[PDB]
Amino acid sequence: PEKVEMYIKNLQDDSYYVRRAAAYALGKIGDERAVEPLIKALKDEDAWVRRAAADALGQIGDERAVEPLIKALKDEDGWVRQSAAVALGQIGDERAVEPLIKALKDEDWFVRIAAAFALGEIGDERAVEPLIKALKDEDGWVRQSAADALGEIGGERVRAAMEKLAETGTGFARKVAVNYLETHK
Amino acid sequence: PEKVEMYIKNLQDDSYYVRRAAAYALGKIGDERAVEPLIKALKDEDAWVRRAAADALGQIGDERAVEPLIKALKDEDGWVRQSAAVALGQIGDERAVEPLIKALKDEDWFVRIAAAFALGEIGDERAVEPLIKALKDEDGWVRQSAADALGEIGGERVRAAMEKLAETGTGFARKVAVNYLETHK
């Protein structure tokens, strides 16, 4: 906690590693003063810095990072987008829901996982139908995370969809739905 | 919490997804009754079940899972080993230190990351020299996680090594060491 301004100041250092390490440290410390300088490091030249900055903003958890993080979901770098999604998941703000639904169709499997995870944490039923679609994703971990997110959301929209999948679905989606029906009253 | 025995019982179900979902749920619930049945699911036929079981044991955090998890660091499946390492990191027990040092040389990049992370969390200085070596890993995320773990460990063995790297090291290891010297008194 004593080193918060030293690390804020290191977000301007010429060395990418010093900037990255500063963002990482500021996420762990959790002091709110770091929020605006981290928002700025979401446009850093170096992708590792942008990743660490998103990560740190999620850890601090201040809603002021929501709109900048939503933008960072369009970053050229896959791991930045992944970090932004996890961070929006951690903050829990419903404004991320539609942008994260889009990121469920991201070309990188690791981004789609993070998008599903985050939708599950936010808990908003608009995500239900897009998560049912992700049950057919070519990546196994994506499918799985969409199933977990469906369970976390819950409620009557999830129940009704799981009845239909248990009835006519195939493959993984079927197994998900049947587990659902066995494990709820 | 009401469903703990239902999910324990589902660890014997014929469907791999029902067993996997049960392990996942039992990790979230956190009831100690789940520990021995999860230890057993670390030898499940299906790799997703073994992964979820390790993950859940780390979340519950009971030291009784330490020796079974150490064994699971030799699993044929890369993601099981990864999960076992993260879990040993979360439990924090020093008995994992030597097995995790070995897993820093794992053939999968994701395992080496998890091994570095876990050593950093356990905080034991036997890891210092092997983590300095990981600064030369071909994977960028591995190197980074080894640098973070060095910072988390700290103390005089880390200080002395970072002085030498700042003096004669090259590339990433150099940048790590110099950041170290700039950020400590």
Residue numbers in the entry:
A (entry chain A), B (entry chain A): 18 to 202
Quoted from the paper:
The crystal structures of the two bidomains were determined with a resolution of 1.94 and 2.55 Å for A3_A3 and A3_bGFPD respectively. A3_A3 crystallizes with one A3 subunit in the asymmetric unit. SDS-PAGE of dissolved crystals showed that they contained the intact fusion protein. The hydrodynamic radius of the bidomain A3_A3 (3.0 nm) is similar to the dimeric A3 (2.9 nm) indicating that the chimeric bidomain protein also adopts a closed bivalve conformation. The SEC-MALS and SAXS results clearly show that, at low micromolar concentration both bidomains adopt a closed bivalve conformation. This was expected for A3_A3: when not linked together the two A3 monomers dimerize with relatively high affinity (KD A3/A3 = 37 nM, ultra-centrifugation data), and in the A3_A3 bidomain, their mutual interactions are further stabilized by their proximity. However, the KD value of bA3-2 binding on A3_A3 (37 ± 6 nM) is higher than with A3 alone (without linker: 4.5 ± 7 nM), suggesting that the intramolecular link between the two binding sites stabilizes the closed form and induces a lower apparent affinity for an external ligand. It seems however clear that, if the two binding sites of the chimeric protein A3_A3 are nearly identical, the binding of a ligand on the first site will stabilize an open conformation of the bidomain structure and will facilitate the binding on the second site. The equilibria between the open and closed conformations for these bivalve proteins modulate their binding affinities for their respective ligands in a cooperative process. This is particularly clear for the A3_A3 protein, which still binds its ligand although with an apparent lower affinity than A3.
